[PDB]
Design a protein around this ligand. Structure first.
Ligand SMILES: O[C@@H]1[C@@H](O)[C@H](O[C@@H]2CO[C@@H](O[C@@H]3CO[C@@H](O[C@@H]4CO[C@@H](O[C@@H]5CO[C@@H](O)[C@H](O)[C@H]5O)[C@H](O)[C@H]4O)[C@H](O)[C@H]3O)[C@H](O)[C@H]2O)OC[C@H]1O
Ligand SMILES: [Ca+2]
Length: 124
């Protein structure tokens, strides 16, 4: 598990840390082409699944690309998030990823807006 608001670096001119109504925090005000960087993520044993707690009031879907090494590095999967009913209505959404082990920098690269609280890598 990784908290979006605990990124090491980012590329954005708009991203803000936001709250949720449950007393948590996360990332909003994301625009197309922004990315969050999480350095030295040990995928440990194995990961073939990605789950994120996300909210969206957008009227088009946002793709969250999961890239290793650089923003144009190996693409291991893409979570596509349509509206959840509103910007403060969080749901947990999952995608499969190419099985990943070892230590990589992780770039979440966004095609549009989404509010994100946290994400979890697991093996189904
Ligand atoms: O304390 C807590 C508060 O922090 C919390 O505040 C909420 C923080 O998050 C806010 O959500 C932002 C709402 O505004 C969005 O910008 C939208 C994004 O969509 C744009 O339009 C898009 C254009 O591109 C199209 O292709 C796409 O389909 C469209 O959707 C629109 O122009 C922008 O206005 C941000 O992305 C969100 O992060 C939320 O409103 C606050 O309420 O509230 C709870 C409290 O406990
Ligand atoms: Ca969070």
């Amino acid at each position: 598990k990784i908290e979006s608001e605990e990124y090491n670096s980012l590329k954005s001119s708009t991203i803000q840390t936001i709250g949720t109504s449950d007393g948590g925090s996360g990332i909003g005000y994301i625009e197309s082409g922004d990315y969050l960087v999480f350095n030295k993520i040990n995928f440990g044993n194995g990961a073939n699944s990605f789950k994120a707690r996300v909210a969206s009031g957008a009227d088009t879907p946002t793709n969250i690309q999961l890239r290793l090494g650089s923003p144009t590095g190996t693409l291991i999967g893409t979570l596509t998030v349509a509206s959840t009913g509103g910007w403060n209505n969080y749901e947990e959404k999952s995608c499969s990823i190419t099985n990943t082990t070892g230590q990589h920098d992780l770039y979440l690269v966004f095609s549009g807006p989404v509010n994100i609280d946290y994400f979890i890598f697991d093996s189904n």
